[PDB]
Design an enzyme around this catalytic site. Structure first.
Site, PDB file in Angstrom:
ATOM      1  N   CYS A 161      14.194   9.579   1.570  1.00 32.62           N
ATOM      2  CA  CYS A 161      13.747   9.027   2.834  1.00 32.62           C
ATOM      3  C   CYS A 161      12.771   9.921   3.612  1.00 32.62           C
ATOM      4  CB  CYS A 161      14.958   8.721   3.728  1.00 32.62           C
ATOM      5  SG  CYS A 161      16.416   8.071   2.859  1.00 32.62           S
ATOM      6  N   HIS A 293      15.755  10.090  13.189  1.00 36.61           N
ATOM      7  CA  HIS A 293      15.853   9.365  11.930  1.00 36.61           C
ATOM      8  C   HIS A 293      16.594   8.073  12.206  1.00 36.61           C
ATOM      9  CE1 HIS A 293      15.684   8.910   7.630  1.00 36.61           C
ATOM     10  NE2 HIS A 293      16.994   8.925   7.493  1.00 36.61           N
ATOM     11  N   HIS A 331      14.560   0.372   7.707  1.00 36.86           N
ATOM     12  CA  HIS A 331      14.329   1.668   7.101  1.00 36.86           C
ATOM     13  C   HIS A 331      13.431   1.524   5.860  1.00 36.86           C
ATOM     14  CE1 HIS A 331      14.804   5.639   5.894  1.00 36.86           C
ATOM     15  NE2 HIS A 331      15.813   5.495   5.053  1.00 36.86           N
TER      16      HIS A 331
END
Lengths: 852, 844
Positions: A161, A293, A331
């Site tokens: 990520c 995040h 995401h």
């Protein structure tokens, strides 16, 4: 020690075809996560129905990128989209990609999947070797480096990520250290293969609701999303636009953890953050906002926000604003960092923070949400000022943090040089593309930085961008023209014109341009000792000032020079030069033979030596017959003087035969008018009484004659003797010879090649009609000033735009005082107005292309 | 400005289970490319029959790496192999991975494929979420960072064929800049999916013959190969082994090219090389050898070698040697750079360049092969000395070059005292692992750097490495022992009766021992005696003098404690027998060396000055209780050794004649009668001397159990400190030894600290069978240094860590070139067999 800035950006996000659409959705509180069947039957294998998806994967302007249709159908749509988005990102910065070709500019791309690779290699029988070149992960970076000619590092990287923010951090380090002057940084993710979502579902990382409820008690996993984002980094000195300055950035890794490899370590995240603030002399107190995040997981949200509390809130008086773009659009895995960076910069540019969605009850495991040390942005809040932080944490423990300093430069206070009209160029793939850019310029015509940037990106090779356009801004009309361009090499020809071009207050319009004015005031220094000032002569609208031969010769030539100076300032270098009569002086300046002083003074004495001389009363008439026909039907003492075209020839002599053997023509219906010479018979034997006194003054003026280049074609000397030693230099002798010899003009125009662009350099474009007849139809003939035109600055600009239309590059920015970059905050985005030729439709893998 | 070295390496290559096997094949000219059906039916889809392949993919010591069997079956075999290979690479450097836990050590892995990922995610119904954690490309680096606890950057990267050398270059930059003290760098490639080979075949990159004919006119493409390779980088100051020093490294990218994205640009490759030599103050003249990329393609070979000619040969008097490992084993794609780096370092370490295969006719498009400016290594050539260059060029234009300086310490690393015998420890997953390492030590017993490194890597937690072993090197025997391990450490300081002629003269060879004895001399020089003189003297009655004995015993007990400490042994419990309670005080932190030696002196001198009547002691075979009754008068129970053994004390006036009334009934059996009434006349004069010696008494820790004072009064204030009073009390009170041994817990390790291990027999009877009782010196043993070493090894065998390197002068690293490799002798528990994707797992 070298300053690194984020210069340009572009991207494609769920439900957002460009960053304008992305912004609209962000500030508008639109949930970009959807539940349609775009990639696979929503619900398949019990998957969440909701995922963030791009509107389209099938468009790609293949021919612009040099990709043949067979290769395009077998390219990862990630890469097709990233090529466009990358180009958009570079020009968004106001930087012409050409200026980075061949540099040691780097490319780093964060990327975690190659699902197209799997699909396109499924059948050995029918697969193409090209699938490797268009799908192997290294190519997500290497094909960018190949197209843009970036010769720095070209690296594809995966830390899950955190990949794209890691990529940003690596690029930042490369620029900081001096390895690279600039870097293209990319982040990409697509949801093509359902099986992939299944793996994440079985690990319990996906929320069933398909939603990232950043910071909320009801968080139960993340929403998978797509994104294609690109950002141009440069060192400060190269930048035009500056979204923000990267103050610091770093990465660490969680290491060993009792709870397993995918449990995030808030303690190590905290260590990373700590290491980038106080140790680099940067206070947590300086932060306004931190982009977390924030994937909305039971475990990760508290680890992160508590780490933020201990590393940053604990060294602060004020509450720290916090947000997460993942609440808005899900995401996008390795592209998370660049997607989030986009939100941050868009927020800063519009002066307001885009809010989070889905934040209803704070997570009770996060003390700082309950006591107000952290304040979630759940409404649009205004940007009060301060630095910005960004976290991106990969699920294997790879953490990245960056610290940004927003650019807060305000626009200048307007001055008198801002009020002048300005010229705006565009190029494009389609006529729509050009119109759209020109329209965007009309609308922000007073934003001078914006116009500079748009002109810089308009100088593009014509095979790449086959439509061009210009507009003149700040004038009563709607002056605009747009057309398709011939892929031809188009050579540039200067034509310096002769007498007959003078008028009252000529060039007073163009004195508003500093380069023009300074050329005229430099021409004044040459002829002040001799009792005359060119600026006084121009200013004087005493309407017979230019009847004086000295006043005319000096003023014509001084202006021809100022125009040459402008053309030069704008980047126009001539491939050929041709003079008509007195024009051969200006031609010398253009060629590099004569200094400005030498040319202006050669004009003076050429006129003063005629004024002082007894030559016999003579006159000239243009007549309608060929050069050859003029030999015969002339009497004695009348001779062919100027070969203008094959129809038009000027003759010269005394009235003793010129008036009476003009009527022996015009009684046979032949064209023929007298011309206002101030009483003289130029370009004939009759001027030969000037030779001794002119030759003497010009030897005191042209110190050391310099060679004439091949580019300059003589009209004083016929082609057979171009080899001669009179021809070799622009000597006192060459000039005197011009004045007594005929003007062999059509002879030089025969030498102008096909598809040429021809600029008439003169205070009125007298020869347009001649040049059209006299040079090939395939050429384009352009004036630069007209006589008594209401605004010549406008006329000049419009015609300078007409040169841009041909394919020849022109930087009008140099005509006006330089814009002080970095551009001010809030200068409009350019990436969203870049339009491609999307007429074709390329293959895209489908769920059925993968195993089940 | 920070010096970066290649410290350690390991790997698996076609036909080569470790780098020893790889070397054997290289220098032996064995073609490692094969044509069997290991991955898929050779010839399938018209593919070349030949590819370079690993011997095995199914082995992985899962439990060592903390991986449960369900996760192991769904791990990319790339990652399973890279975990082992990474560990092997770190220890090859002579670095215990524990010492890098928690550091900002980085991990960079070059990797281009995740074919296992495709296979293991093919069926939504039956796939496991674990497949992601064991196959996503980031995990090739992140799982390494997780196992080793490396907290620096953890990055997986793809630049196609240049990936691993790029990874090396990135790591190099990170260490150079101070970001990282060290870096693990990896390269991996497997041929599991045939479709992949088909893509390369259709691009015209593969030779039909499956061969990289590096530099040869008949080159027609490359051979696909596998590899799993890892290298440890560190900054110079951390390194033990040093294969080479990285002088410079960089990357560029070809950029735009008329001919297409996969046509390599020799001109840009040339620019890269140029930028790393003269501009950094490094002359092309310094190169001995360049390892070319050398894939054997019609186009790439001339682009490369001509680029090399213009950037390097043009600035040289001598011909430049050139080679390519791809000729030997094929092209392992992103792992190419590390595979090639392995050949280069192996060549340097053996002093000979492994030759290329398949080089018959030079490519005529390469002028420098025809005119001798480039000399292909087609025969084994000796290593004449100089720097080494390495090219790795990826097929999308990403180029990397590194410049290495080989390690030129040829001579051994300087130290004192090399001729002494040495001790070697090993640990392992299997008894084979331990044997193999010990065997390798016996064989290079004189290489001291090698022995140091092997001892450093032997200190490993016992749950991880359940077999241990030791060997003593440089001695007539074959002293070696090895066993499995499942343990608290007890020091026992012994009393009188342990003296002998020239005791501890063997151990004076050790600097730590000698310095402890010479420090004990400083204490008793003002009082007219030198412990070193007393030891040296083999006048055979010197230790009949009570002062000579007490001072010498205690000074040695101290020196031994000093050794045990230098070696890292900290005691969990301490127990003294009689005079041992002085040494115990030093071990516990109550007494300085001076205080203890002088307490020994005056304890002896105050008895010498009291001039007492002849008394004697005999150990007898009857209980503590039974000794009360059957004693006469004037004889008393003095030392409770075990429940069988009790020492008695008195005058000969009853001790000899009422010893015989025992030993006629078959009962077991410096001129004084200690731990009895006879000594109570010393109390006042000793108590006075010891108050001048023990200035300020310090507390006795819980770890130290008294034998002078019974357990009920351990709480007392006499017991609280090692005062003048405690010492005097010891001398007159009985020795309650078995009483303290009752307190030693199950499975304990017990070291008898004394110049002869007199109490071994007692300790065995007196403490639980589950304990292990170890001596440290024997009386008149031919070599006590050997004996000490052997027993110190026996402590390593129990599970307790021991660093024998501290016993000897330090080895000056970097180790010399040619120090044997360690990676190949690390052996795993490969009893399990894990799943591996097969051709049938992919579409067709």
């Amino acid at each position: 020690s070298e300053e690194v800035v984020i210069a340009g950006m572009s991207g494609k996000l769920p439900e957002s075809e460009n960053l304008q659409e992305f912004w609209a959705n962000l500030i508008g509180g639109v949930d970009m996560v959807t539940d349609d069947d775009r990639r696979w039957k929503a619900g398949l294998y019990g998957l969440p129905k909701r995922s963030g998806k791009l509107k389209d994967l099938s468009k790609f302007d293949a021919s612009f990128f040099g990709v043949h249709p067979k290769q395009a159908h077998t390219m990862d749509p990630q890469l097709r989209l990233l090529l466009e988005v990358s180009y958009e990102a570079i020009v968004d910065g106001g930087i012409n990609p050409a200026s980075l070709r061949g540099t040691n500019t780097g490319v780093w791309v964060g990327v975690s999947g190659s699902e197209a690779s799997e699909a396109l290699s499924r059948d050995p029988e029918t697969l193409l070797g090209y699938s490797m070149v268009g799908c192997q992960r290294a190519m997500m970076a290497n094909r960018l480096s190949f197209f843009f000619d970036f010769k720095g590092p070209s690296i594809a990287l995966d830390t899950a990520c955190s990949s794209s923010l890691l990529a940003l951090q690596n690029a930042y380090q490369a620029i900081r250290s001096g390895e690279c002057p600039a870097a293209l940084v990319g982040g990409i993710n697509l949801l093509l293969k359902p099986n992939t979502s299944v793996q994440f579902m079985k690990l319990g990382m996906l929320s069933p609701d398909g939603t990232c409820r950043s910071f909320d008690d009801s968080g139960s996993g993340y929403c998978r999303s797509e994104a294609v984002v690109a950002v141009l980094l440069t060192k400060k000195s190269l930048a035009r636009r500056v979204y923000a300055t990267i103050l610091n950035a770093g990465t660490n890794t969680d290491g060993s953890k009792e709870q397993g490899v995918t449990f995030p370590s808030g303690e190590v995240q905290e260590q990373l953050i700590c290491s980038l603030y106080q140790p680099a002399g940067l206070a947590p107190e300086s932060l306004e906002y931190i982009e977390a995040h924030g994937t909305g997981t039971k475990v990760g949200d508290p680890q992160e926000l508590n780490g933020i509390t201990r590393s940053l809130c604990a060294f602060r008086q004020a509450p720290l604003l916090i947000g997460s773009t993942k609440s808005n659009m899900g995401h996008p895995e390795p592209a998370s960092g660049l997607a989030a960076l986009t939100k941050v910069l868009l927020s800063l540019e519009h002066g307001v923070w885009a809010p989070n969605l889905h934040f209803h009850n704070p997570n009770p495991e996060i003390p700082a949400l309950l006591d107000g040390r952290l304040q979630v942005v759940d409404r649009p809040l205004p940007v009060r000022g301060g630095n910005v932080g960004i976290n991106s944490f990969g699920f294997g423990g790879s953490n990245v943090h960056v610290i940004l300093q927003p650019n807060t430069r305000q626009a200048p206070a307007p001055t008198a040089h801002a009020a002048l009209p300005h010229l705006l160029h565009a190029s494009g793939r389609t006529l729509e593309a050009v119109q759209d850019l020109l329209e965007q310029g009309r609308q922000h015509s007073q934003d001078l930085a914006f116009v500079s940037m748009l002109n810089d990106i308009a100088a593009t090779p014509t095979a790449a961008m086959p439509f061009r356009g210009y507009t003149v801004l700040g004038v009563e009309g709607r002056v605009q023209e747009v057309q398709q361009v011939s892929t031809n090499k188009r050579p540039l020809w200067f034509i310096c014109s002769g007498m007959g071009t003078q008028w009252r207050g000529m060039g007073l319009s163009l004195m508003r341009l500093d380069s023009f004015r300074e050329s005229i005031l430099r021409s004044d220094e040459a002829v002040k000792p001799l009792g005359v000032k060119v600026s006084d002569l121009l200013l004087s609208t005493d309407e017979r000032t230019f009847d004086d031969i000295v006043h005319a010769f000096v003023s014509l030539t001084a202006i021809q020079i100022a125009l040459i100076d402008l053309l030069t300032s704008v980047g126009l270098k001539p491939d050929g030069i041709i003079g008509h009569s007195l024009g051969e002086v200006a031609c010398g300046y253009a060629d590099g033979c004569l200094s400005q002083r030498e040319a202006v003074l050669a004009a003076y004495w050429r006129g003063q030596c005629i004024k002082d001389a007894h030559l016999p009363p003579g006159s000239m008439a243009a007549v309608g017959l060929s050069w050859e026909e003029c030999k015969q039907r002339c009497p004695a003492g009348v001779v062919p003087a100027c070969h203008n075209s094959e129809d038009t020839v000027t003759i010269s002599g005394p009235q003793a035969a010129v008036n009476e053997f003009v009527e022996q023509l015009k009684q046979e219906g032949v064209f023929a008018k007298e011309v206002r010479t101030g009483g003289l018979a130029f370009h004939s034997y009759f001027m030969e009484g000037i030779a001794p006194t002119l030759l003497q003054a010009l030897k005191k003026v042209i110190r050391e004659p310099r060679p004439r280049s091949a580019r300059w074609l003589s009209t004083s000397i016929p082609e057979a003797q171009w080899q001669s030693s009179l021809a070799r230099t622009s000597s006192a002798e060459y000039n005197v010879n011009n004045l007594v010899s005929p003007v062999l003009f059509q002879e030089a125009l025969w030498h102008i090649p096909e598809h040429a662009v021809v600029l008439e350099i003169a205070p009125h474009a007298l020869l347009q009609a001649v040049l059209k007849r006299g040079v090939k139809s395939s050429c384009t003939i352009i004036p630069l000033m007209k006589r008594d035109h209401k605004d010549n600055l406008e006329f000049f600009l419009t015609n300078l735009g007409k040169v841009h239309l041909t394919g020849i590059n022109v930087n009008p920015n140099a005509l006006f005082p330089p814009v002080e970059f970095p551009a001010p905050r809030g200068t409009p985005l350019i990436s969203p107005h870049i339009k491609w030729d999307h007429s074709q439709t390329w293959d895209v893998p489908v769920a059925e292309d993968f195993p089940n």
